[PDB]
Amino acid sequence: MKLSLMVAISKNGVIGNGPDIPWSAKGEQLLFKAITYNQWLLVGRKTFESMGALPNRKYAVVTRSSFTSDNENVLIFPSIKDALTNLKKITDHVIVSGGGEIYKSLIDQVDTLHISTIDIEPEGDVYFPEIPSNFRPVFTQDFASNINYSYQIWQKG
Amino acid sequence: MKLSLMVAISKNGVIGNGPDIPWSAKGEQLLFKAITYNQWLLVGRKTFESMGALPNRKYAVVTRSSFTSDNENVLIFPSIKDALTNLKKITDHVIVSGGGEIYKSLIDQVDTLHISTIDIEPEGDVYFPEIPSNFRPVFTQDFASNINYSYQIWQKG
Numbered sequence A, B: 001m002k003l004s005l006m007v008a009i010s011k012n013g014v015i016g017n018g019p020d021i022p023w024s025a026k027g028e029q030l031l032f033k034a035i036t037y038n039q040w041l042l043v044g045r046k047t048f049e050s051m052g053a054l055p056n057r058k059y060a061v062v063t064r065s066s067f068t069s070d071n072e073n074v075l076i077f078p079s080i081k082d083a084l085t086n087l088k089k090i091t092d093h094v095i096v097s098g099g100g101e102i103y104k105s106l107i108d109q110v111d112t113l114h115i116s117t118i119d120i121e122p123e124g125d126v127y128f129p130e131i132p133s134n135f136r137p138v139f140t141q142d143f144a145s146n147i148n149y150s151y152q153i154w155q156k157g
């Protein structure tokens, strides 16, 4: 089973402010929607509760409480380890989609990074892990918008 | 100035039938929308008419006729050499977006290919050109849909 990771990182490393993403760069959301279409996403409970279950995606949500969901596209797991154990039996690809705790736990296990660098330096308290040395960028594209952003795909190798 | 190329190819190389793309693969468009957001597209007249000027893209259209446009986001050029010469003045990046004739003319000059392979063998009379040997895939992601597709990015070198 392949593991991807998708995140938008502001220029100072902030990816979140409380439960929110502290920016709105018009168009960057299109990358997220395109790459995650009909994919399995692994998200922590805080980010899931904050984003909700968008259509045309499947969600594996991890929680140590007894958080539930009656949405048919949402599975809940008591641990990241159990999510992975089960996911590899029901799909061949999972996209790690946050938040901060989930990226910290999974960064060293993923095969492909999707990183949008957002041209802003906002206030926030959630950060992205430092990127392991074996990842290298293989594709880059710049976008002009209300807040500029740059999309970059990294591969392990 | 960098040139990219974005295309959706079916399994027998067909990309068009008359003016029409002879499939609809739900979700695939999102890739096109995401990658072309606020970008310059270089297109031939036939494709441009068939799609029209969808919003938040800028269009460079080639024609040998007197085809014109009122739209501020559309520029019309008598030749490819003229399109590229003029584009180099105002942008650092251009995405070649079709159709068959444009693709064939430009593929040897582009740096990056975005290819979605569409899991269908339709009838058509417009084919994508052969890919030059110095291109290599650097990223691949499968999507299941009403018609399956696979998205792959190629780099020259």
Ligand SMILES: NC(=O)c1ccc[n+]([C@@H]2O[C@H](COP(=O)([O-])OP(=O)(O)OC[C@H]3O[C@@H](n4cnc5c(N)ncnc54)[C@H](OP(=O)(O)O)[C@@H]3O)[C@@H](O)[C@H]2O)c1
Binding pocket: A006, A007, A008, A009, A014, A015, A016, A017, A018, A019, A020, A021, A043, A044, A045, A046, A047, A048, A050, A062, A063, A064, A065, A066, A067, A077, A078, A079, A080, A081, A097, A098, A099, A100, A101, A102, A103, A105, A126
């Ligand atoms: N910028 C971006 O691209 C982006 C993307 C996604 C999220 N974010 C941001 O990230 C922030 C939220 O991140 P966060 O780190 O606070 O929370 P989070 O990672 O979204 O969720 C953390 C929760 O996940 C559960 N969890 C974590 N590790 C677990 C494990 N090993 N086993 C079982 N459950 C586990 C726990 O839920 P329980 O409390 O129920 O036990 C934990 O409280 C928000 O600001 C959001 O906007 C940004």
Ligand SMILES: NC(=O)c1ccc[n+]([C@@H]2O[C@H](COP(=O)([O-])OP(=O)(O)OC[C@H]3O[C@@H](n4cnc5c(N)ncnc54)[C@H](OP(=O)(O)O)[C@@H]3O)[C@@H](O)[C@H]2O)c1
Binding pocket: B006, B007, B008, B009, B014, B015, B016, B017, B018, B019, B020, B021, B043, B044, B045, B046, B047, B048, B050, B062, B063, B064, B065, B067, B077, B078, B079, B080, B097, B098, B099, B100, B101, B102, B103, B126
């Ligand atoms: N599957 C996909 O990803 C995809 C993407 C895009 C398009 N398509 C399909 O491809 C088909 C259209 O392709 P096509 O090859 O027939 O047409 P095209 O490449 O879109 O346009 C051809 C026209 O471009 C102009 N042209 C071409 N070379 C020129 C040059 N060197 N100088 C000046 N003008 C030039 C001419 O316009 P004038 O006739 O006005 O002089 C010519 O008729 C459609 O079915 C479309 O849907 C498929």
Ligand SMILES: CCc1nc(N)nc(N)c1C#C[C@H](C)c1cc(-c2ccncc2)cc2c1OCO2
Binding pocket: A006, A007, A008, A019, A020, A021, A028, A029, A031, A032, A047, A050, A051, A054, A097, A098, A115, A116
């Ligand atoms: C579009 C945002 C984004 N961009 C990139 N490049 N990578 C990501 N991983 C995310 C993300 C995200 C999380 C899942 C998220 C999505 C969304 C969201 C809601 C509605 N449409 C699109 C995304 C809202 C969120 C939210 O966390 C905080 O609130």
Ligand SMILES: CCc1nc(N)nc(N)c1C#C[C@H](C)c1cc(-c2ccncc2)cc2c1OCO2
Binding pocket: B006, B007, B008, B019, B020, B021, B028, B029, B031, B032, B047, B050, B051, B054, B097, B098, B115, B116
């Ligand atoms: C979405 C289709 C597509 N996928 C990929 N991966 N690459 C591409 N270059 C195109 C394309 C295209 C052309 C420009 C095109 C777009 C569109 C279009 C219409 C509405 N929203 C987005 C694209 C319609 C077209 C059309 O040609 C025939 O009719």
